[PDB]
Design a protein around this ligand. Structure first.
Ligand SMILES: O=C1N[C@H]2NC(=O)N[C@H]2N1
Ligand SMILES: O=C1N[C@H]2NC(=O)N[C@H]2N1
Ligand SMILES: O=C1N[C@H]2NC(=O)N[C@H]2N1
Ligand SMILES: O=C1N[C@H]2NC(=O)N[C@H]2N1
Lengths: 123, 123, 123, 123
């Protein structure tokens, strides 16, 4: 975990995220999305659970990206929840929630759900 | 948003989260869960999109809590994705993903999905 | 369950669904949505698990509505997954997935997630 | 769609589902799960939206399986929401919700979310 998590990861859509997993469960980094109302890099912050494992389980973690930077303001935020599996072919398997800011009338349709798999190799 | 978000919020399960929304989209604080394999306060970190709105839309945001502190290590992490609606009765409406670290055989059943509504009043 | 489920239910958005729970786990009926690219009644079909419970647990069930009828064709389908809780104030608590048919380029953003609570009283 | 959907499909976990898509949006068939508190075949019912598409979009559909048959009663139900993409390598991409019947105290953790991809070839 931690050391194993720090680095550059790529997902199936071609997005890239660079993260640093700190000693006490913090995750900090940047995310560049290959799809969406996203342009350039966005700041990401999250946490991982730093004391994962005598039965080769994954390390649970999550992070958030607010889609606003100096080139775009998409009025939305995405959170990724999943686990890090290390090894030869280490990966982070996630499910994500993308919520857009809406008026109250459209709040029922404000959130998209999806899944992303990240690897150290692209892809 | 931001100022409006900073403070103490409570949800329908009796959990409490105190957050500070910083000038540039950062969210930092603590979360105390009334249910689960959770005991005491846990650190939370997230982001909000700091330039939300000429049509009274909500402010999108998200945060993560890794369920590990000095009293418990639940080997899981939860991410909340939603939006802040301010006003008289301001609230943060969210959907969450709770992922547990599992062996590869059980990874298909590693994530729970739910929804929480937070208010400034409890509840 | 079954008998308890058969009837008319209403949710927080003002939608109404009439269902008949058959002896062997089948659910058949119609759904009229108060929001969306929906007009009139749509056919629904689902299942419930007909042998639910010495510890007052809910009865798990699910149903699907394809948003096509003789007045509208929204090219989408919604599935509701949840449980029936009977009693004085019986309710069906659900989480739903609404998938729209998209081109392959937009498949990552094809599904919305939400939650609906149905009661026998409106609302 | 419809004709294209009728047949046997397999997913990444080795589950198999045989379905018949009827002329007016109905889906009927059986599902055999390779994982879980599932043994043998279970009945499935759903709907698809029968008038999908001048821009090669997928056909939205959904189905439900209550995990009860003559060999097992898992007190749960799963709904799959997604779209059918036809062609050489046709597939049905889905996201699913598995709800278990719980007591009211545990209702917040009653639903798991996941994703399955089905192909006509196994896998
Ligand atoms: O990498 C990405 N994953 C998808 N989820 C999301 O929010 N934007 C898309 N880009
Ligand atoms: O406040 C809480 N919300 C629920 N989601 C979660 O992860 N733990 C529970 N407590
Ligand atoms: O009743 C409704 N619930 C929401 N989900 C959905 O698919 N349409 C909306 N209407
Ligand atoms: O095929 C399967 N998919 C998964 N979802 C589910 O409910 N059971 C598992 N089996």
């Amino acid at each position: 975990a931690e050391a194993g998590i720090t680095g550059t990861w790529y997902n199936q859509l071609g997005s890239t995220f660079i993260v640093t997993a700190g000693a006490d469960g913090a995750l900090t980094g940047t995310y560049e999305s290959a799809v969406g109302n996203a342009e350039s890099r966005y700041v990401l912050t999250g946490r991982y659970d730093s004391a994962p494992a005598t039965d080769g389980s994954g390390t649970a973690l999550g992070w958030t990206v607010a889609w606003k930077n100096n080139y775009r303001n998409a009025h939305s935020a995405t959170t990724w929840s999943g686990q890090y599996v290390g090894g030869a072919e280490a990966r982070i398997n996630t499910q994500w929630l993308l919520t857009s800011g809406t008026t109250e009338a459209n709040a029922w349709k404000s959130t998209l759900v999806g899944h992303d798999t990240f690897t150290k190799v692209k892809p």
